[PDB]
Design a protein around this ligand. Structure first.
Ligand SMILES: *C[C@@H](COC(=O)CCCCCCCCCCCCCCC)OC(=O)CCCCCCCCCCCCCCC
Ligand SMILES: *[C@@H]1O[C@H](CO)[C@@H](O[C@@H]2O[C@H](CO)[C@@H](O[C@@H]3O[C@H](CO)[C@@H](O)[C@H](O)[C@@H]3O)[C@H](O)[C@H]2NC(C)=O)[C@H](O)[C@H]1NC(C)=O
Ligand SMILES: *[C@@H]1O[C@H](CO)[C@@H](O[C@@H]2O[C@H](CO)[C@@H](O[C@@H]3O[C@H](CO)[C@@H](O)[C@H](O)[C@@H]3O)[C@H](O)[C@H]2NC(C)=O)[C@H](O)[C@H]1NC(C)=O
Ligand SMILES: *[C@@H]1O[C@H](CO)[C@@H](O[C@@H]2O[C@H](CO)[C@@H](O[C@@H]3O[C@H](CO)[C@@H](O)[C@H](O)[C@@H]3O)[C@H](O)[C@H]2NC(C)=O)[C@H](O)[C@H]1NC(C)=O
Ligand SMILES: *[C@@H]1O[C@H](CO)[C@@H](O[C@@H]2O[C@H](CO)[C@@H](O)[C@H](O)[C@H]2NC(C)=O)[C@H](O)[C@H]1NC(C)=O
Ligand SMILES: *[C@@H]1O[C@H](CO)[C@@H](O[C@@H]2O[C@H](CO)[C@@H](O)[C@H](O)[C@H]2NC(C)=O)[C@H](O)[C@H]1NC(C)=O
Ligand SMILES: *[C@H]1O[C@H](CO)[C@@H](O[C@@H]2O[C@H](CO)[C@@H](O)[C@H](O)[C@H]2NC(C)=O)[C@H](O)[C@H]1NC(C)=O
Ligand SMILES: *[C@@H]1O[C@H](CO)[C@@H](O)[C@H](O)[C@H]1NC(C)=O
Ligand SMILES: *[C@@H]1O[C@H](CO)[C@@H](O)[C@H](O)[C@H]1NC(C)=O
Ligand SMILES: *[C@@H]1O[C@H](CO)[C@@H](O)[C@H](O)[C@H]1NC(C)=O
Ligand SMILES: *[C@@H]1O[C@H](CO)[C@@H](O)[C@H](O)[C@H]1NC(C)=O
Ligand SMILES: *[C@@H]1O[C@H](CO)[C@@H](O)[C@H](O)[C@H]1NC(C)=O
Lengths: 550, 6, 525
């Protein structure tokens, strides 16, 4: 039964069970939030008082009818959120007076269309439109987006699109990021043609692409702005690849493809037209696949029908998709590949030995095999010798057996991430060449390791009673060595760390006894710059940058 | 992985 | 046992200084070359003498004249070629395997070795009757090695093997298996072959050699060790065994070799109760995984174990199988294993320990139609109960469920087999506990040890009326009085119920985040 507020002017009337817009509103209010109530009705005078309001958040209340002129006096309002209400239909009158509006979210309302009069023509300041719904938004007409020339974010949620009039999205000159939700492919070809010259990033959501057929577009030779293409929750078949790949012929400038929580009801039996395979995926440098569900993942094909298509790509991500082998021939065909991220898969040295064959991944500089099932650092590093250009490896989140004294690694490996790796000792396995080492979140009792070049040394969340000798790394730049078991570090330790420029010590059971905590106490002060995280005194909570001693 | 059917 | 171990001591003679009444002496792995009487005369009490891995050329059994008590002599891995014909009657274990004997050194006097139980031999030539002198002893192991053996003038060599519990045969470790000796056996409990290298060209050579050691009186076990073989040949090896009297078949350190194609096979009535494969290296990378996995899936035995391999999956049997035991330890299996598999309705115990099972709720949907499942060990995987779709469909029949050592959170109690009796959830990540721990009232053992639990909602362990074991240790319990009372009154009222990280009664086991004080010590008024 209470509306609050704050000094700035940010009133918060959230889940107080209202049946009407809170009585008495002030011209001091800059941001009103009346979400999640039963404001079934907004009336003529309900919002005349707060004429200086920049933000009106009415999300998911119970709003089913809003008088036409409800918003007339809100002429400074830039953020309007009516999502998730029972607006059975929309009025052209609500938005006319809001010449200051930048953001307007209308999704979540049971309207069938956007009504018979353009809603947005007089909104020269609009940057973000969100319309549509899951179960009833069914038509898209050419009037619907008249008067809109540019938008940062357009989000049409049209899962139930029964009909899309030709050329609806074409009048819009520039769209920075269009998010479409279609349940099936019936209109994708038609809409894709309308956004060839406007959209800069297309995100397609929740689409059954199972039986998607391509065919040449009516459109004229228009150079497309589109640089990113992303499929969120799509169902795809091996056929879909063959057709979808044909779309890139219209978006020559494209440089990134992404597939998110997508299902592939297939096995990689791709047969790409030959025109497309000569193109080598155009200007697409980066390909990203996350959580691709493949029902019979184990029956997956050679994937050799695309070995030529991908000779030019530079960054590939295939995360949490049950990858268990990148066939050697594939690897040798990924000539131009610089970044490879195979996190959260099924790689084991046995497969990795094939996937990194003698001629594999020639340009690879970064390998990421986090959260796979590796169990021997010696076997791993030795397999990877095939990678001559490898300069940074991440085999973290892999429950390794104890590393030995003698290992080999890529002679240019400057970055090794062994975090969360279960280890409890560090031997001379780790190569001297290492400029960055991350051995945090483990069971290390002592880091006692000569690594000259070593700049950074992330080694937090450990059981380290004692701090490492400052000779072990003469050119050191950083040392994240928090959440540890440090009682107190020897006075005169950052002497030969004439290089250290940032440090971590927080969350640590120390010992702030005036007779002993001399050095630390005053060094942390001289260079408060070189330091993030505030050291907690054991039992006091008082910072170590505090009181010094005579 | 598997090769095709030739 | 009164022992002196002098192995790797670089020795040359038998240390004349040793304690006179010594009983077990090992001079293994040295450079002793001759063994004269005055070398061991004094050790009158000697029972055991291990001389494995030396350089002795001749061995005179009279040399042991004064060791009337010697029962274990191991002169394997030397360079023996000559041998006194009469071994000491005191022998129970005589090992002469891996030497340089032309022909089996078993003389007629070996009959006097009535107490003999282990016999180890090696040779390069075999005649049918060579082991006749020991055919009337109640032997337990005959170790025999054909490392020294080459093929000869086609006139097939024979060799009658005396009745033994175990027959262990070791071959040359660096070549295609090429034995043509005809080996008979009457009574055999366990045949065991080591160092088997096959392609398709010598596959049959092995099947023939096995044919006669395998002809059956009763049942026997077979063990293959270090087999590197074609896939074609492996599918043959299985088929060769199926009709034969082999109850347990075991394979250790298998290496699949040149290609994996679809091989012909049918499994008919068999004596086989158990296939067990452990440690599988695979050198083929491209092949139809059906061609490999179906060969096992369609097997009509009761127990299949396949462990420590690169395998990523197992196919669901095409027809109702008779598997009642499945153990796929330490592979790379996923939660899609046996998805909606309605053809393991006899399966009682399934073991998926040490794999890549991700989605705890997919792992529940797996057992949906496993009408006989009582034990499910999906431990040491990568499980977690954060699934978007948290729908439960457990087999109503599970009694023992090892979920220990994953990344399970607390929602894990929203979804547990109706009639569970054992629930090992140790080494997980549970703080998040729900009010569903009493809608599952039949447990007897419980292990929520090594977790992240601070407190436990008041009134749980009350309805766990059948509880009797509970591992509460290694948890960061909040011991501030307003809410640590319930657990303290509990541990005390049930002192015997709480076990430790070892297995014995211990109410101390539960400790506090701060002092380390036993939670049952605390008194909140
Ligand atoms: C046999 C093994 C081998 O699998 C691998 O080699 C894994 C490496 C993945 C290489 C990624 C190449 C993708 C190129 C995309 C081109 C964009 C076209 C744009 C169209 C509009 O198999 C496995 O181990 C199985 C598990 C993981 C492999 C499955 C992922 C490969 C799918 C690639 C395309 C998905 C998009 C759907 C198209 C219909
Ligand atoms: C699993 O089986 C394989 C064989 O399929 C075993 O590897 C083999 O091991 C033997 C003995 O270690 C190797 O013999 C060696 O040969 C070299 C010359 O090549 C010789 O100088 C040595 O004295 C020794 O006899 C053999 O080469 C090797 N075979 C292969 C193909 O590598 C292995 O021992 C088994 N693994 C386990 C777990 O025991
Ligand atoms: C399910 O299958 C696994 C795999 O075979 C079984 O575990 C295996 O059991 C044997 C015997 O316990 C282990 O041998 C051990 O080797 C060590 C190493 O030298 C030795 O010191 C021990 O005394 C023992 O002999 C073997 O390593 C082990 N394999 C693995 C990968 O763990 C298991 O028993 C089966 N489970 C059930 C319930 O049947
Ligand atoms: C695999 O498992 C599913 C679910 O466990 C089986 O379908 C289920 O079968 C039961 C009968 O055992 C169906 O019960 C039906 O309703 C009542 C119970 O409320 C029952 O008393 C009736 O006899 C009637 O059949 C039930 O519809 C169904 N549960 C589902 C669909 O979730 C399925 O048949 C199994 N497939 C096999 C046996 O391979
Ligand atoms: C080295 O690897 C670890 C683990 O993969 C990284 O730490 C994680 O970083 C992500 C952000 O990328 C965080 O969301 C997680 O909290 C971290 N995991 C934990 C708990 O450690 C780490 O960032 C990597 N280091 C470098 C230099 O890239
Ligand atoms: C052959 O194999 C069986 C199974 O290993 C052996 O039997 C073992 O001991 C008892 C009684 O014989 C069996 O019931 C167990 O199943 C076996 N114990 C295990 C699993 O290690 C037997 O030793 C062998 N001898 C035969 C049957 O000839
Ligand atoms: C279920 O699985 C785990 C193994 O993942 C078993 O845990 C072992 O317990 C015994 C003592 O009872 C130890 O010898 C092993 O070292 C334990 N393994 C580890 C390190 O987790 C457990 O026995 C099984 N659960 C039950 C109660 O049967
Ligand atoms: C603004 O919108 C109204 C109809 O909704 C129309 O009468 C008016 O002419 C429009 N002005 C612009 C920007 O053309
Ligand atoms: C490394 O990458 C470059 C660029 O592809 C290539 O030309 C070269 O052969 C590779 N090998 C090394 C280590 O120089
Ligand atoms: C044979 O055995 C008996 C003891 O069992 C022993 O007295 C006798 O001397 C032995 N014969 C020889 C020559 O070994
Ligand atoms: C061993 O085998 C032979 C038959 O070849 C038989 O005469 C003898 O009685 C058997 N007895 C045992 C089990 O030692
Ligand atoms: C092998 O030896 C036995 C006799 O001990 C005999 O019955 C069998 O026919 C022989 N056949 C071959 C060469 O396999």
């Amino acid at each position: 039964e209470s509306l609050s507020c704050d000094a700035s002017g940010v009133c918060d009337g959230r889940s107080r069970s209202f049946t009407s817009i809170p009585s008495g509103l002030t011209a001091a209010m800059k941001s009103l939030d009346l979400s999640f109530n039963k404001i079934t009705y907004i009336g003529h005078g309900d919002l005349r008082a707060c004429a200086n309001l920049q933000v009106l958040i009415l999300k998911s209340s119970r709003i089913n009818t809003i008088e036409g002129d409800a918003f007339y006096s809100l002429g400074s309002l830039e953020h309007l959120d009516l999502s998730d209400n029972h607006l059975s239909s929309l009025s052209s009158s609500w938005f006319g007076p809001l010449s200051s509006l930048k953001y307007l979210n209308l999704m979540g309302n049971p309207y069938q269309t956007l009504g018979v009069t353009s809603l947005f023509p007089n909104l020269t300041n609009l940057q973000t439109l969100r319309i549509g719904n899951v179960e009833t938004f069914s038509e898209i007409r050419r009037i619907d987006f008249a008067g809109l020339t540019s938008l940062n974010e357009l989000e049409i949620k049209a899962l139930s699109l029964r009909n899309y009039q030709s050329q609806s999205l074409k009048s819009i000159r520039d769209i920075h990021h269009l998010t479409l939700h279609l349940s099936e492919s019936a209109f994708l070809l038609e809409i894709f043609a309308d956004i060839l010259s406007s959209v800069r990033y297309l995100e397609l959501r929740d689409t059954n692409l199972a039986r998607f057929q391509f065919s040449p577009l009516p459109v004229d030779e228009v150079s497309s702005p589109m640089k990113k293409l992303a499929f969120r929750g799509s169902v795809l078949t091996d056929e879909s690849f063959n057709e979808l790949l044909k779309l890139l012929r219209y978006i020559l400038e494209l440089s990134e493809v992404e597939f998110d929580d997508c299902t592939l009801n297939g096995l990689g039996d791709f047969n790409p037209s030959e025109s497309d395979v000569v193109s080598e995926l155009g200007k697409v440098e980066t390909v990203t696949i996350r959580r691709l569900h493949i029902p019979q993942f184990y029956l997956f094909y050679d994937l050799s029908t695309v070995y030529s298509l991908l000779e030019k790509v530079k960054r590939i991500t295939v995360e949490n998709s049950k990858v268990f082998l990148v066939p050697c021939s594939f690897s040798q065909h990924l000539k131009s590949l610089e970044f490879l991220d195979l996190s959260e898969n099924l790689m084991v040295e046995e497969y990795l030995k094939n996937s990194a064959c003698k001629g594999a991944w020639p340009s690879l500089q970064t390998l990421v095999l986090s959260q796979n099932h590796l169990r021997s650092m010696q076997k791993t590093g030795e397999i990877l010798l095939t990678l001559k250009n490898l300069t940074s490896l991440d085999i973290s989140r892999n429950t390794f057996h104890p590393m030995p004294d003698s290992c080999q690694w890529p002679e240019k490996m400057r970055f090794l991430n062994l975090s969360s790796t279960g280890i409890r000792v560090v031997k001379t396995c780790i190569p001297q060449t290492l400029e960055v080492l991350d051995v945090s979140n483990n069971n290390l009792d002592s880091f006692s390791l000569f690594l000259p070049r070593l700049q950074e040394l992330y080694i937090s969340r450990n059981k380290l009673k004692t701090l490492p000798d400052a000779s072990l790394f003469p050119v050191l730049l950083v040392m994240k060595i928090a959440s540890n078991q440090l009682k107190s570090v020897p006075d005169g330790i950052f002497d030969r760390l004439t290089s250290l420029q940032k440090i971590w010590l927080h969350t640590n059971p120390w010992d702030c006894s005036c007779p002993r905590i001399d050095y630390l106490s005053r060094w942390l002060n001289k260079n408060s710059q070189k330091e993030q995280g505030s050291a907690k005194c054991s039992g006091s909570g008082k910072p170590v940058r505090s009181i010094i001693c005579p | 992985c598997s090769k095709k059917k030739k | 046992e009164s022992m002196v171990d002098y192995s790797n001591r670089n020795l040359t003679h038998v240390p004349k200084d040793l304690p006179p009444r010594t009983k077990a002496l090992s001079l293994s792995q040295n450079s002793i070359s001759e063994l004269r009487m005055p070398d061991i005369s004094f050790l009158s009490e000697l029972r055991v003498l291990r001389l494995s891995h030396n350089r002795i050329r001749s061995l005179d059994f009279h040399v042991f004249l004064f060791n009337q008590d010697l029962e274990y002599l191991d002169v394997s891995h030397n360079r023996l070629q000559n041998i006194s014909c009469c071994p000491m009657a005191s022998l129970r274990h005589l090992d002469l395997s891996f030497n340089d004997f032309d022909v089996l050194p078993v003389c007629k006097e070996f009959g006097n070795l009535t107490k003999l139980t282990f016999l180890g031999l090696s040779a390069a030539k075999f005649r049918q009757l060579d082991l006749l002198p020991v055919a009337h002893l109640h032997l337990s192991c005959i170790l025999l090695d054909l490392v020294s053996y080459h093929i000869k003038g086609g006139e097939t060599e024979s060799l009658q093997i005396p009745n033994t519990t175990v027959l262990h045969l070791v071959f040359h470790p660096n070549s295609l298996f090429s034995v043509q000796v005809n080996m008979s056996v009457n009574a055999l409990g366990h045949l065991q072959l080591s160092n088997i290298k096959l392609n398709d060209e010598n596959c049959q050579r092995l099947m023939t050699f096995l044919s006669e050691l395998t002809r059956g009186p009763t049942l026997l076990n077979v063990t293959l060790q270090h087999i590197e073989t074609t896939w074609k040949c492996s599918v043959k090896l299985f088929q060769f065994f199926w009709p034969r009297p082999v109850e347990y078949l075991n394979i250790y350190n298998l290496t699949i070799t040149e290609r994996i194609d679809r091989e012909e096979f049918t499994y008919s009535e068999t004596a086989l109760k158990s296939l067990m494969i452990e440690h599988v290296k695979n050198q083929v990378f491209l092949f139809s995984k059906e061609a490999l996995y179906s060969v096992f899936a369609e097997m009509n035995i009761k127990m299949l174990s396949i462990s420590d391999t690169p395998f990523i999956h197992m196919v669901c049997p095409p027809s109702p199988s008779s598997f009642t035991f499945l153990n796929f330890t330490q592979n790379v299996f996923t939660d899609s294993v046996f998805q909606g598999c309605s053809t393991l309705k006899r399966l009682q115990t399934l073991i998926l320990q040490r794999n890549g099972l991700k989605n705890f709720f997919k792992v529940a949907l797996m057992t949906k139609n496993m009408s006989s499942l009582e034990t499910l060990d999906v431990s040491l995987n990568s499980l977690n109960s954060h699934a978007y779709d948290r729908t439960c469909a457990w087999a109503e029949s599970i009694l023992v469920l090892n979920l220990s050592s994953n990344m399970l959170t607390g929602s894990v109690f929203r979804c547990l087999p109706p009639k569970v009796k054992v629930l090992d959830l140790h080494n997980n990540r549970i703080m998040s506990i729900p009010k569903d721990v009493t809608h599952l009232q039949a447990l007897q053992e419980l292990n929520v040890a090594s977790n992240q639990l601070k407190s436990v909602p008041d009134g749980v362990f009350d309805r766990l009326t059948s509880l009797q074991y509970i591992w509460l240790h290694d948890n960061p319990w909040d011991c501030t009085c307003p809410g640590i009372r319930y657990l303290s009154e509990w541990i005390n009222k049930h002192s015997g119920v709480v076990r430790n990280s070892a297995g014995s009664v211990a109410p101390d086991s539960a400790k506090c985040s701060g002092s380390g004080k036993p939670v049952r010590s605390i008194i909140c008024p």
